[PDB]
Amino acid sequence: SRSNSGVRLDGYARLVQQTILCHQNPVTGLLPASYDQKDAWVRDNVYSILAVWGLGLAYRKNADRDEDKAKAYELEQSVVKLMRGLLHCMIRQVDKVESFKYSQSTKDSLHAKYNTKTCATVVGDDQWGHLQLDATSVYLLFLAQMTASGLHSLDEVNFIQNLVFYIEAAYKTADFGIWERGDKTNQGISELNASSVGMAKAALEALLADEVQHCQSILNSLLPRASTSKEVDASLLSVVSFPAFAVEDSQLVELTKQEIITKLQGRYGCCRFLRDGYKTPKEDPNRLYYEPAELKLFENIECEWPLFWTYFILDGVFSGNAEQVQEYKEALEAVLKNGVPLLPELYSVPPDRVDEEYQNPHTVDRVPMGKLPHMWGQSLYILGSLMAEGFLAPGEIDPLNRRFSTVPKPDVVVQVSILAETEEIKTILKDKGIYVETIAEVYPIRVQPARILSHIYSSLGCNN
Amino acid sequence: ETLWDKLDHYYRIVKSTLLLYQSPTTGLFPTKTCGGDQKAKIQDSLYCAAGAWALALAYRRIDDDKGRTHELEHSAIKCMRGILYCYMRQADKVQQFKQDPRPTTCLHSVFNVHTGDELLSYEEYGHLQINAVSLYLLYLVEMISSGLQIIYNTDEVSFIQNLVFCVERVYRVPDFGVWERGSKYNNGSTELHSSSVGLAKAALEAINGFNLFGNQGCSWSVIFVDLDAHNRNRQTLCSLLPRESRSHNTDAALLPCISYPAFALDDEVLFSQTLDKVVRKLKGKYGFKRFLRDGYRTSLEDPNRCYYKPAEIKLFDGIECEFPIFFLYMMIDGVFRGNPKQVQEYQDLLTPVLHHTTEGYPVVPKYYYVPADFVEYEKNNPGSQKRFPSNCGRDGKLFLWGQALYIIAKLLADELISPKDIDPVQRYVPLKDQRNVSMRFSNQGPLENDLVVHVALIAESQRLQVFLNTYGIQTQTPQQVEPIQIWPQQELVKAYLQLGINEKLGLSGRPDRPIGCLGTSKIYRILGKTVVCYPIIFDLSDFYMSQDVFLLIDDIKNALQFIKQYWKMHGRPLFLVLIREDNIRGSRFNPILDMLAALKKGIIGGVKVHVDRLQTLISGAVVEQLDFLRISDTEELPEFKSFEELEPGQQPDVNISEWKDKPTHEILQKLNDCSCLASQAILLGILLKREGPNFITKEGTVSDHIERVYRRAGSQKLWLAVRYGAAFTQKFSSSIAPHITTFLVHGKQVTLGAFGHEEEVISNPLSPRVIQNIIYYKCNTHDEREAVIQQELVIHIGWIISNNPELFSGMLKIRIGWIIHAMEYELQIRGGDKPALDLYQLSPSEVKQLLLDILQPQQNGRCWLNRRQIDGSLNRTPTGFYDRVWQILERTPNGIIVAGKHLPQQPTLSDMTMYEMNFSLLVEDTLGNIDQPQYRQIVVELLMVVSIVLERNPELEFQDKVDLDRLVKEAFNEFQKDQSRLKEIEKQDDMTSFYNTPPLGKRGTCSYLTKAVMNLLLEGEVKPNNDDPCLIS
Amino acid sequence: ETLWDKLDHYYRIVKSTLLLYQSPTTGLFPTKTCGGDQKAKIQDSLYCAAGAWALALAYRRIDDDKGRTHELEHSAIKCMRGILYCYMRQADKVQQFKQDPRPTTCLHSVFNVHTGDELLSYEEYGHLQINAVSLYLLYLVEMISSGLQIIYNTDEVSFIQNLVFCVERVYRVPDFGVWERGSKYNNGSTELHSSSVGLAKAALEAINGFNLFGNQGCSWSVIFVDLDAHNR
Ligand SMILES: C/C=C(\C)CC/C=C(\C)CC/C=C(\C)CC/C(C)=C/CC/C(C)=C/CC/C(C)=C/C
Ligand SMILES: Nc1ncnc2c1ncn2[C@@H]1O[C@H](COP(=O)(O)OP(=O)(O)O)[C@@H](O)[C@H]1O
């Protein structure tokens, strides 16, 4: 394997080490967002370790010598370390998981940012809009997937099931979104984003199916629209495709992808959503919120994010494709340091050229700003490259077969037992031709009302 | 005394009495220290090299050795790279021995000490001593582990592998043994010796995965043993373990095996059962007898005649030569096993028998013989006479093997070497440490066995995975596990064919056999990809047994139970339950779903299982890295195909006899008017004979129409046709031969052949093609439907012998034709007046339940005519039947005649011992001519009664030959007379009434027989006996 | 009694009286089972993790553990990757202690069980207990040898080496000791204790040449002790 596949694997090892693993904290295992943003986002940390997990998987499928075993073990244990660090980040907020379990309020939600040096909390609850069901759901989904891939207390198992209850009611819980700003208007208004709902559905499926299919109902109804205040969000690729695969309707997935391509895709990536204005030259940089009258200003000049084209390579790899047009179009990578791609966070219309871009959409030569490299995007870029170059397979990143969601599922035959409450009732049912068994006869199977089932689950997840 | 002085004492003895004799050229040591004999025996050189290495292990504890560590160690390498040379020159023979292990294809075990050339030929000497090839490999592992570099290049590694391929199949190669003669009788006969199989189990346990380069080693220097072949050696040793062979109930060669150097046995109760018999029956003042009735250099032995003639073996009883070396092995066993008083007891026994050379160096005489003038006195009072040494050392004669063992034992006893030092590979595992030693002990320990096999349910197609999920079972298609490759076992057999391939030495590779359930239960890294293999149970086959799903579910349970009982490797076993869409077709779905569901629950057959995704199951598991494949000659890596997703009558009316007397094209006429796939198989099977392989049929070549009817009724589950088809097309299963070895490894002998027809006796392991002649041509020449049913029972009995061995206890010769007879009768007794079902129409699984039911301990309830017919037909013997028949022969001067056979007191009493397995076979041969199976049970009962009368009454002894048939006839005639007095039954010479009478009861069968035996015994002298001298006399 | 029953007796005692108390977050166990003290002593957590690992070593002799080998072993890793966290946050102090081993430059030996932060200061508590850094390293070697994977990346290996550079020069750093007081007199005085130097001789004998990666390890994961400092 070292002839012509070990050298390229080592090249990707340098890529991941110099883009991702260089910034992993030896104490906590978390990844700071950038030099300016020293805090560690849950979702960004979960996504940024995908390249490391894929490299470890690559290294292992070819680990026979020691050195190769050493590299594979180092990568897998770095992934385990990052997930454990995020766990103690959530574990320290068990009082918030417990409170959000019953009262799903934005003031009782897990924080998105954490101190990358102590796994503690950096800002106050009031200070970031921490409710992001997608970050906790993506963490749970990849915890399920990594474990199903062979990556290894019961107290944290109880905590994980309490997190399952935490993200369980995500179909009816308003969220601050994957972009941690709620609605577009950007007034800190919690809103129900299909991205969060789909990620929660995927996490629950990978890890009670009633709320799962409630999330499925939300997804079917909302798609191809993102949420109440969004025609389309490019984050929906994380639901209709990798990593959630939460939509089992192939037509709906295709329609969502086509909406993203038609509305948000530009010369430098896909805009997050219409009238985003995250790093546009028209916003006020020092003003946190957005007045309702400046959202027009953001139209046709929204920043295009290269991160979303990593999703379009991932699907295309997960679903076989000649979408080798999404790759070869990511020549818009910063350095070709030495030659490291350094996938940018976004491209903004140069300020002078606002009128030309407004008028002539997706046509002006934008500049890269924001995080560089975008580790969430860079990890997906490296993973897609790995997968596309034959060093990885969909079944290794997805051992739970989440990709097989779109396949039509056959109708199910519901077995029903008609049970007589009393024997006299059984006698009447028989005179009329339905041969049944009484609830006493069905012993040792004990029939109970659904209230008892709901009460039983109240004893699941309890560690006092 | 300083250590230098303490060990200079041994260096003087080693250098004078052992290393002086080492060949300057070969490195091998000479058997005769003084003389013109050029013989270097393989075993004695290995023990001599071990003696020099033991001194080096001692001199390693001194930094200023003055060169003695390098010399003594490099002398050991010299002897071991000299045995390798002798073998490497005879590598034309290593290839021939892997393919056809035989007495005349073996590596020679005696070579010219000076040149390394073959000295004695196959006729002159019995060279098949696999104790020697196997101790070469145990010592090479134990010395390479110590730091001694014996294997130098990859070609030497390929020869050591080819040497391993030979040592794996020892269970099926009978040999001459450490003693070079075979049995106590020097008939020129090879027999399986626990000692040879035990050393092979130990070489294989030690060499599996041993870098033969040592510390300076990589993946391409490792030796790979077959977990399945090693199991077959473990199974053979344990079914011959308080004993040594069919001939020897104890041999002192068991002591080298059970304890240093091999330390093979893994049961502490068998070690004690084996050692105690060896010490009790073989120990002497001057040493341990090699075996009882041994004629080596005895005064009564004829020097000129090589082969002892029948009954000569008696002349050597009490005159047996006693070898002082066994005292040294017992001292080494004591140092290892922590008995500081077994070292002293046997040191004290050796200090007297030890001669000393002129310079004071101790000489361990090879044997101590009774001088001829004193032979009768020893025979009269054994242990009384004084036996002269064989070599005194001053004579110029030294036993180089014993000289070496003195150094090993004296150094170990004096604590100048440690048990750990001379057993670098830990062959001795102290009880408290018998937990995680691969191929021997598992985490659970020596006694507990609740293994959880790691099941992975793999589905042939996505369609089947989605179908199985709807019905409750999550399975994974071959593609969903993408990096992991699921391979048929046969694709690993192709890969292994490239292990040990040296074209310089003419070596070829692993022999092409099936990898089994303990080798398909491992995860392999072959050419950079992870390969897990589906078990051989899931391999498609022509035989009709495959069609019964119930047999597949049972083979899955049977395999997992074998994996539980016999997998002692580090990882959890990985069983992959390949599910094929054919398996769920029709009503096979309900049985398969219950197996698949129990596999999901975690228990199928008492074997706990963990079904999980292969990726999770293969994750931190130990993977056997198959690095021998390399690129080799071809610049391309070998092409290995991996399982891939398969993407989308009531009775035959035509009777054979009335339709075979016809030669007519009319058989081809009914062929067009037979809808019965059983009438078609009978009609289109008469013609595979009379008209030919291709006599044109309306359909086409006849060979194609029977294979179409066999295959068609196989699916339509029309089992009479499937069996007429298999037989007519002469179908044999790959598993008949692998299972017939379960019978043989377990000490049982299979007879194929019908009841009332030519039987044949497979007493030794045989090839599939020899076994096939025995079933379709040599034994069954009247009905070949019998060969398919007999093939069906060998497969069923073979797994029953492996997993439930005691459903076949009291059975030594398993007569499959007789067992089928018991089954046809059980169908009639079960049937009642309603006609009995035809065993042939019964489904393979229904034939397995009939067998399991007939084998079930006969319980209070059935007619004693039915109990007898089943027991007699199964040839079940009451426990100790064979020992009790010895006691009848010992107290009967002229022997027992049964059914025109005769067990005479001599030559058997003279040539055999009470518990000899050879005797059990002679008793079984004597009762061979008993055609009727219920008569066999009455004859087995007369013999059991004759044993109680003779034992309870020690005074009575038979004068003339006991005719067991006459004693039975006289018992029936008394019964006939007494029952006549009750009700005058008019049936004559019908013993049905007698057989139905219970054995013990008011007037049962046991009374009549006791009476008959007593009338015969009392017609002869009553010897006054002294145990209870007569009070009224 | 079956082994399952014999060892379920210890799992009930371990789970009630030891693993109930393990911090959900740090992995460290609390010195006071009941109360508002947040002190997790380093030595007591190591002895607690060793107790869970000893039960896992026992449950390894049963194939149907029902998850108890993974939990009891992974509890031990939790406590040991929690002491490492407490030390790894205080690695500004590991550098200062290698250069100037002193009572006020040491890694703290009592940390917040809930957060892993320093609880008592150098004035409040005598944190120079090299029995603790040294038993961390003896137990990390004894647990990584067992099959328990505690060190995950090269940076954790570099901290364990820097922890070793500190444990080598113990002969010249007087400490407070297992008993936290120093001498019989609680004068606030550090003295060389055979117990602290003895555990350091043992951590150094065990960790010289040890792949901290275990079986999944290479040359770049080995810890290197100074034969001369060990001699001292
Ligand atoms: C499973 C089968 C069984 C339990 C066997 C059942 C036993 C039966 C049918 C009877 C067996 C009887 C036996 C062995 C013998 C009897 C005796 C006491 C014989 C005496 C013969 C004799 C003439 C002795 C001389 C007495 C002396 C020495 C006088 C001084
Ligand atoms: N059809 C089969 N069913 C079960 N086990 C088999 C089969 N074929 C081979 N094996 C096993 O494979 C191993 C080696 O195969 P083979 O050389 O045929 O064995 P043997 O010589 O004992 O018949 C043995 O453990 C044997 O039992």
Q: Are the C-beta atoms of A234 and A305 separated by less than 8 Å?
A: yes
Q: Are the C-beta atoms of B236 and B193 separated by less than 8 Å?
A: no
Residue tagged 């040296």 (tokens): B502
Any atom of ligand 2 within 6 Å of the Cβ of B536 = yes
* SS3 annotation, B258-309: HCCCCCCCCCHHHHHHHHHHHHHHHECCCCEECECCCCCCCCCCCCCCCCCC
Q: Which residues contact B60 (CB under 8 A, 6 or more apart)?
A: B69, B421
In this structure, what token pair is assigned to residue B425? Answer: 């590979």
Q: Indicate yes or no: CB of C155 within 8 angstroms of CB of A154.
A: no
Which among B435, B451, B608 has the least Cβ separation from residue C61? B435
Longest dimension (CA), chain C: 56
- Between the CA of B947 and the centroid of ligand 1 the distance, in Å, is 10
Amino acid at B895: G
In this structure, what token pair is assigned to residue C179? Answer: 């008993």
Task: Give partners of C (≥3 CB pairs < 8 A).
Answer: A, B
Q: Could you give the C-alpha distances from B1006 to A61, B1009, B1012, in angstroms and in order?
A: 72, 5, 10
**Cα–Cα distance, B490 to B532 (Å, whole number):** 12
In this structure, what token pair is assigned to residue A135? Answer: 């970050």
Strand, coil or helix: C222: strand
Q: Are the C-beta atoms of B842 and B719 separated by less than 8 Å?
A: yes
**Cα–Cα distance, B193 to B170 (Å, whole number):** 10
**Exposed, middle or buried, C156 (CB in 10 Å: 0-12/13-18/19+)?**
buried
Distance from CA of A198 to the nearest CA of C (A): 28
Q: Which residues in chain C are closer than 8 Å to B572, comparing Cβ atoms?
A: 63
Distance from CA of C52 to the nearest CA of A (A): 11
Report the candidate in B932, B940, B733, B736 with the shortest Cα–Cα distance to residue B822: B932
Backbone phi and psi for residue A355, each to the nearest 5 degrees, phi listed first: -65, -40
Q: Which residues in chain A are closer than 8 Å to B615, comparing Cβ atoms?
A: 148-150, 395-396, 399
Dihedral sign from CA coordinates of A282, A287, A290, A293? negative
| Cis preceding-peptide flag for A224 (omega within 30 of 0) | yes
**Cα–Cα distance, A17 to A40 (Å, whole number):** 18
Nearest ligand atom owner, CA of B948: 1
Amino acid at C83: I
Given ligand 1 and candidates B884, B888, B947, B952, which is best to mutate, with the most ligand atoms within 8 Å of its CB? B952
- Between the CA of B229 and the centroid of ligand 2 the distance, in Å, is 9
Q: Indicate yes or no: CB of B618 within 8 angstroms of CB of A150.
A: yes
Closest-CA residue in chain A for C79? A153
Q: Are the C-beta atoms of A153 and C52 separated by less than 8 Å?
A: no
Euclidean distance between the first and the last CA atom of chain B, given in angstroms as a whole number: 74
Distance from CA of B450 to the nearest CA of C (A): 7
Which among B470, B479, B615 has the least Cβ separation from residue A410? B470
Q: Could you give the C-alpha distances from B405 to B338, B365, B620, in angstroms and in order?
A: 19, 12, 44
Q: Indicate yes or no: CB of B444 within 8 angstroms of CB of C62.
A: yes
Strand, coil or helix: B31: coil
Atom of ligand 2 nearest to the CA of B737: 23
In sequence order, which ranges of B453-588 are alpha helices (DSSP H)?
462-470, 489-496, 549-566
Backbone phi and psi for residue B111, each to the nearest 5 degrees, phi listed first: -135, 165
| Beta partners for residue B118, in sequence order | B111
**Cα–Cα distance, B420 to B336 (Å, whole number):** 9
**Cα–Cα distance, B455 to A436 (Å, whole number):** 38
User: Which contacts of B906-911 are long-range, i.e. CB under 8 A and separated by 24 or more positions?
Assistant: B906/B311, B907/B310, B907/B311, B910/B311, B910/B313, B910/B314, B911/B184, B911/B185, B911/B293, B911/B310, B911/B311, B911/B313, B911/B314
Dihedral sign from CA coordinates of A313, A317, A319, A321? positive
Strand, coil or helix: B208: coil
In this structure, what token pair is assigned to residue C82? Answer: 């929690």
Closest-CA residue in chain A for B618? A150
Atom 11 in ligand 2: residue holding the nearest Cα = B516
- Between the CA of B941 and the centroid of ligand 1 the distance, in Å, is 16
**Cα–Cα distance, B631 to B845 (Å, whole number):** 46
**Cα–Cα distance, A320 to B390 (Å, whole number):** 83
**Cα–Cα distance, B61 to B10 (Å, whole number):** 14
b/e code B379-398 from CB counts within 10 Å (16+ = b): beeeeebebebbbebeeebb
| Cis preceding-peptide flag for A444 (omega within 30 of 0) | yes
**Cα–Cα distance, B443 to B466 (Å, whole number):** 37
Q: Which residues contact B949 (CB under 8 A, 6 or more apart)?
A: B956, B1010, B1013, B1014, B1017
| Beta partners for residue A388, in sequence order | none
Which among B528, B616, B618 has the least Cβ separation from residue A1? B528
Q: How far is CA B766 from the centre of its chain?
A: 13
In sequence order, which ranges of A360-407 are alpha helices (DSSP H)?
375-388, 394-397
Give the technique used to solve this structure.
Answer: cryo-EM
- Between the CA of B278 and the centroid of ligand 1 the distance, in Å, is 35
**Cα–Cα distance, B791 to B545 (Å, whole number):** 10
Q: Indicate yes or no: CB of B450 within 8 angstroms of CB of C63.
A: yes
Q: Are the C-beta atoms of B458 and B612 separated by less than 8 Å?
A: no
- Between the CA of B515 and the centroid of ligand 2 the distance, in Å, is 7
| Cis preceding-peptide flag for A243 (omega within 30 of 0) | yes
**Cα–Cα distance, B412 to B58 (Å, whole number):** 9
| Beta partners for residue B356, in sequence order | B362
Q: Which residues contact C92 (CB under 8 A, 6 or more apart)?
A: none
Any atom of ligand 1 within 6 Å of the Cβ of B879 = no
Q: Which residues in chain B are closer than 8 Å to C64, comparing Cβ atoms?
A: 450, 452, 608
**Cα–Cα distance, B170 to B101 (Å, whole number):** 9
- Determine how β-strand B288-289 pairs with β-strand B110-112: unpaired
Q: Are the C-beta atoms of B378 and B319 separated by less than 8 Å?
A: yes
A-C CB pairs within 8 A amount to: 83
Which among C60, C61, C63 has the least Cβ separation from residue B452? C63
Nearest ligand atom owner, CA of B881: 1
Q: Indicate yes or no: CB of C63 within 8 angstroms of CB of B608.
A: yes
Substitution target from B436, B441, B448 for chain C, most C beta carbons within 10 A: B448
Atom of ligand 1 nearest to the CA of B1033: 30
Q: Which residues contact B242 (CB under 8 A, 6 or more apart)?
A: B249, B250, B270, B273, B274, B277
DSSP sequence for A127-142: GTT---HHHHHHHHHH
**Cα–Cα distance, B126 to B122 (Å, whole number):** 6
- Determine how β-strand A304-305 pairs with β-strand A269-271: antiparallel
Report the candidate in B453, B494, B721 with the shortest Cα–Cα distance to residue B599: B453
Crossing angle between the packed helical segments B702-715 and B677-690, to the nearest 10 degrees: 150
Q: Which residues in chain A are closer than 8 Å to C24, comparing Cβ atoms?
A: 91, 94, 155-156, 159
In sequence order, which ranges of B483-612 are alpha helices (DSSP H)?
489-496, 549-566, 589-601
C→B interface, C-beta within 8 Å: 3, 60-64
Any atom of ligand 1 within 6 Å of the Cβ of B957 = no
User: Which contacts of B104-110 are long-range, i.e. CB under 8 A and separated by 24 or more positions?
Assistant: B107/B133, B107/B166, B109/B41, B109/B42, B109/B43, B109/B180, B110/B31, B110/B39, B110/B40, B110/B41, B110/B42
Atom 26 in ligand 1: residue holding the nearest Cα = B1030
Q: Are the C-beta atoms of B228 and B745 separated by less than 8 Å?
A: no
Given ligand 1 and candidates B877, B937, B955, which is best to mutate, with the most ligand atoms within 8 Å of its CB? B955
Q: Are the C-beta atoms of C131 and C178 separated by less than 8 Å?
A: yes
**Cα–Cα distance, A385 to A13 (Å, whole number):** 12
Q: Are the C-beta atoms of C110 and C125 separated by less than 8 Å?
A: yes
Backbone phi and psi for residue C59, each to the nearest 5 degrees, phi listed first: -80, -10
Report the candidate in C50, C81, C54, C80 with the shortest Cα–Cα distance to residue C68: C54
**Cα–Cα distance, B794 to B732 (Å, whole number):** 11
Eight-class DSSP state of A298: T
Q: Indicate yes or no: CB of B616 within 8 angstroms of CB of A401.
A: no
Atom 4 in ligand 1: residue holding the nearest Cα = B948
| Cis preceding-peptide flag for A373 (omega within 30 of 0) | yes
Q: Which residues in chain C are closer than 8 Å to B442, comparing Cβ atoms?
A: 63
- Between the CA of B952 and the centroid of ligand 1 the distance, in Å, is 5
B→C interface, C-beta within 8 Å: 435, 442-445, 448, 450-452, 572, 608
- Between the CA of B172 and the centroid of ligand 2 the distance, in Å, is 12
In this structure, what token pair is assigned to residue B853? Answer: 């039911």
Q: Which residues in chain C are closer than 8 Å to A73, comparing Cβ atoms?
A: 149, 213, 216-217
**Exposed, middle or buried, B197 (CB in 10 Å: 0-12/13-18/19+)?**
buried
Q: Indicate yes or no: CB of C88 within 8 angstroms of CB of A27.
A: yes
**Cα–Cα distance, C71 to C56 (Å, whole number):** 8
Task: Give partners of A (≥3 CB pairs < 8 A).
Answer: B, C
**Cα–Cα distance, A398 to B32 (Å, whole number):** 71
**Cα–Cα distance, B354 to B350 (Å, whole number):** 6
Which among A70, A92, A152 has the least Cβ separation from residue C213? A70
Report the candidate in B702, B706, B684 with the shortest Cα–Cα distance to residue B693: B702
Any atom of ligand 2 within 6 Å of the Cβ of B741 = yes
Any atom of ligand 1 within 6 Å of the Cβ of B953 = yes
Q: Could you give the C-alpha distances from B577 to B546, B553, B612, in angstroms and in order?
A: 15, 10, 11
**Exposed, middle or buried, C185 (CB in 10 Å: 0-12/13-18/19+)?**
exposed
Any atom of ligand 1 within 6 Å of the Cβ of B948 = yes
Report the candidate in B201, B249, B248, B220 with the shortest Cα–Cα distance to residue B158: B220
- Between the CA of B771 and the centroid of ligand 2 the distance, in Å, is 14
A27 touches chain C (CB under 8 A): yes
